[PDB]
Design a protein around this ligand. Structure first.
Ligand SMILES: Cc1noc(Cn2c(=O)c3c(ncn3[C@@H](C)C(=O)Nc3cccc(-c4cnc(C(F)(F)F)nc4)n3)n(C)c2=O)n1
Ligand SMILES: Cc1noc(Cn2c(=O)c3c(ncn3[C@@H](C)C(=O)Nc3cccc(-c4cnc(C(F)(F)F)nc4)n3)n(C)c2=O)n1
Lengths: 48, 400, 78, 80
């Protein structure tokens, strides 16, 4: 278990961002093109 | 070109700043020219080159900070000249609006543990400690203990659940003087603590519950409420005392590790609470006829209690089954096996591996974290102390 | 897929638990299915939590630990 | 940490022999640091007999103890 947890923690941030990317990629493949064009933003304004 | 720099310095070249407010020492430091920086340091005009910089230049800061950031080896060479073997340590380059302990703060921000472990920097930190830091922390700790110790004396000298006031234990007037003194001390520390983030919440709870515990000093209250608040107050008094111990060399890293482990666990309870809920509700249905599982809440608490291995197999599964008192016996045994696989093994080993990783990450930078804690404590102390007192207690050198 | 099996078990056992809405069934079978349904309902809810930032990595770790254990039970069962 | 829990258990579970004295309570708290919490004999059975003064406080302290000492403190020592 210690080895498994260490291996998971080695790439924790990459695995998290990959999970988000995979979720949204799979969602986009099932959503209609008209809706995606409706909700797609081209820019967002805030405030080794 | 170190020889070129030495030759130009030997001919009394003027040390100036260019149109970007940079001197030749700045250019050498930003290019990591170790040899010419060593030549400048060992030159007879090193003090003159040290004084040439602009306080308003963002890029070309004080050459000591630039040395710490760019060429820490040259900074080590410079610091070796500050300890003259009756060893005397000079702190001329260790401090210069500027933050207090500027050189040491720069060392911490740049992970210069080899610089922070230098005998000159160690003696600088020890000097600041023995000058004001130990005294300030001891005053704070004594102020806390003035309410922590009388409360503990009250708890261990009065039988819990019994009402008491200044006169005595409601009447047993035998330790009346000690009881009254401790009650007054707790009340005074609690009201003084009102005149002095998780730590603030903890202290507020401590002072409120301590006031209610010793309230019969003025207004009578029932013994149940008194001791209900006394339990909370003594528990949080001794729990918050661990935060005062974080400002010691031997205790700070352990408290840091405890905080890391506790935060990692708390971020994970919001996930495995549903595992516990599943098993607890299933055990509530399956083992309903037994007292530990007679209510959903009691069943959940019991499931939480058997997560360390106290599954109670014989009392809850084997003996009821051999008495034919187990409704759904196959289901009960299957869920027992699944629980044992999941919570006391998979979940506990997950937590153990997470803790092992957390402790390893903390130990990776233990010395840096310790010295950074000391530097931060003294820097924050200096930002609040008056300038006259700091000038009074500031030593420029230490003889050992 | 494991999630499909879990959801199928959940829906079947939940139907049998609330079956007396239409057709009467014995209480023993009803609560036997209710235990299974509530257990797998709250167990499968952890798969919905894997799609959150704060919970996904913990569920990944739990899956890794459980799979490593299950691959090893076939040995230490003997 | 053991002093905090041992003195709190002394007030809360005073009517029980393992917590009848401040010193016995601290030894008992030290003994349950490995997982021998004695939940049924000290928390569940007294509560169902209505012999638990401050029952909500006792169960809250029981959960906080289990989180802190047998889990956080033991895993800290294991990781160390
Ligand atoms: C990191 C970090 N953060 O702040 C600091 C402060 N700090 C030091 O502690 C320190 C030091 N130079 C040496 N020292 C130690 C040896 C020193 O004084 N120690 C000392 C003093 C009084 C009491 C106790 C003591 C220890 N233990 C317990 C307990 F009952 F909890 F066990 N009670 C009391 N210890 N510096 C520069 C410093 O900043 N260090
Ligand atoms: C990896 C990964 N895979 O999918 C994603 C999705 N995912 C996020 O989650 C996410 C995000 N940007 C921020 N966010 C978080 C802050 C966000 O919304 N969180 C949020 C929202 C609603 C409820 C909850 C919550 C949390 N916890 C519980 C529990 F009860 F279980 F404790 N209930 C509810 N949390 N992105 C880009 C993303 O894809 N992340």
């Amino acid at each position: 278990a210690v080895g498994d947890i260490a291996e998971v923690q080695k790439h924790a941030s990459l695995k998290r961002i990959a999970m988000q990317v995979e979720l949204h990629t799979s969602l986009e493949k099932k959503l209609p093109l008209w809706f995606l064009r409706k909700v797609d933003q081209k820019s967002t304004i805030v405030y080794s | 070109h170190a020889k070129a720099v030495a030759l130009l310095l030997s001919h009394n070249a003027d040390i100036v700043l260019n149109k970007q407010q940079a001197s030749f020492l700045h250019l050498a430091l930003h290019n990591k020219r170790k040899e010419v920086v060593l030549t400048i340091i060992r030159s007879k005009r090193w003090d003159e080159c040290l004084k040439i910089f602009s306080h308003n230049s963002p890029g070309n800061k004080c050459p000591i900070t630039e040395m710490i950031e760019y060429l820490p080896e040259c900074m080590k060479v410079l610091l070796d000249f500050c300890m003259l073997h009756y060893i005397e340590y000079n702190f001329k380059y260790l401090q210069c609006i500027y933050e207090p302990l500027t050189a040491l703060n720069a060392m911490v921000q740049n992970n210069r543990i080899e610089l922070l472990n230098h005998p000159v920097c160690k003696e600088y930190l020890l000097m600041k400690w023995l000058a004001y830091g130990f005294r300030a922390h001891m005053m704070n700790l004594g102020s806390y203990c003035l309410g922590l110790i009388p409360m503990t004396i009250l708890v261990v000298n009065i039988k819990p659940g019994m009402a008491f006031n200044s006169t005595g234990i409601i009447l047993d007037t035998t330790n009346s003087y000690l009881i009254k003194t401790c009650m007054i001390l707790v009340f005074l520390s609690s009201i003084f603590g009102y005149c002095k983030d998780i730590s603030n919440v903890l202290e507020w709870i401590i002072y409120t519950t301590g006031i209610i515990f010793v309230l019969p000093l003025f207004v009578e209250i029932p013994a149940h409420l008194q001791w209900q608040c006394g339990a909370i107050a003594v528990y949080f008094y001794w729990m918050n005392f661990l935060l005062y111990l974080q400002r010691f060399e031997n205790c700070g890293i352990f408290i840091v590790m405890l905080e890391v482990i506790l935060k990692t666990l708390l971020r994970s309870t919001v996930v495995f609470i549903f595992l516990l809920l599943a098993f607890g509700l299933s055990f509530y249905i399956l083992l309903n006829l037994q007292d530990p599982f007679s209510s959903p809440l009691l069943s959940i608490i019991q499931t939480f209690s058997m997560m360390l291995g106290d599954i109670n197999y014989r009392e809850s599964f084997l003996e009821p089954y051999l008495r034919n008192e187990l409704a759904h016996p196959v289901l009960s045994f299957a869920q027992l096996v699944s629980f044992t696989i999941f919570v006391p093994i998979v979940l506990m080993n997950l937590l153990i591996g997470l803790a092992v990783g957390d402790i390893a990450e903390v130990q990776k930078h233990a010395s840096l974290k310790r010295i950074a804690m000391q530097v931060e404590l003294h820097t924050s102390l200096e930002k609040k102390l008056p300038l006259w007192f700091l000038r009074k207690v500031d030593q420029k050198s230490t003889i050992v």
